[PDB]
Amino acid sequence: MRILMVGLDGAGKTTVLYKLKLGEVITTIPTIGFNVETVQYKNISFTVWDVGGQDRIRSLWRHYYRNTEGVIFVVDSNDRSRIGEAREVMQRMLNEDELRNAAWLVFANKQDLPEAMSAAEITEKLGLHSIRNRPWFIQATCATSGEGLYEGLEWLSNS
């Protein structure tokens, strides 16, 4: 299974990936580029493309769209200023023809932080209810603990 994981910078995309691959919480640098890794979960081998979220790189995601079976969209639940921006990025991503049938999994992340928005709140802000054309799911996660990560891999594998 081919997976594209994106989201704004600092959402926690690489932390998520290497928690999944190494069971370890690594010390990230901003990703100017991608990381690509293969992860085994329950007889599925997920090839995850973690593509950096800062602006220059954001402009490049479209090259990773093609062949994508599922999309992990990571959100920093503690950052309320950038939630609209996330909504804007994700909405036009939903309009992409190469992403047309891909399974849509939102991770509301850093759920560990006291003022993190809830997954329900995030669902309203991102406009997730309005997707009728394909599968979507939202999952509260904490990438450092590992909470919600495998519930994500589970949902994804049931595409």
């Binding site: 100017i32 991608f34 220059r56 790189i57 402009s59 490049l60 479209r62 090259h63 093609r66 062949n67």
Partner: protein, 91 residues
């Protein structure tokens, strides 16, 4: 591929295949058809996707090659930006 102007559908297939040699050969086949002067933009997203960050020189060199002879014309996988897919991860 000496000069074969309709072969762009096969090149897309050959460009990502999970085999590095095939990808290199494909991108090479694109170069030779452009230099003669033949069809090339269909491929762009495929071309750009494997190679981008890597320090692995041969594909990078190949992509680097294709950016001095047609970068401006091709726009499927590049479009128009300041830090295009010609140079963003080529920093």
């Amino acid at each position: 591929m000496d000069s074969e102007p309709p072969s762009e559908i096969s090149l897309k297939n050959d460009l990502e295949k999970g085999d590095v040699k095939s990808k290199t050969e494909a991108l090479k086949k694109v170069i030779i058809m452009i230099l003669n002067g033949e069809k090339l933009p269909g491929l762009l997203m495929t071309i750009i996707r494997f190679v981008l960050p890597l320090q692995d020189h041969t594909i990078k060199k190949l992509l680097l090659v294709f950016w001095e002879i047609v970068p401006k014309t091709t726009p499927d996988g590049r479009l128009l930006h300041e830090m295009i897919l010609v140079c963003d991860a080529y920093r």
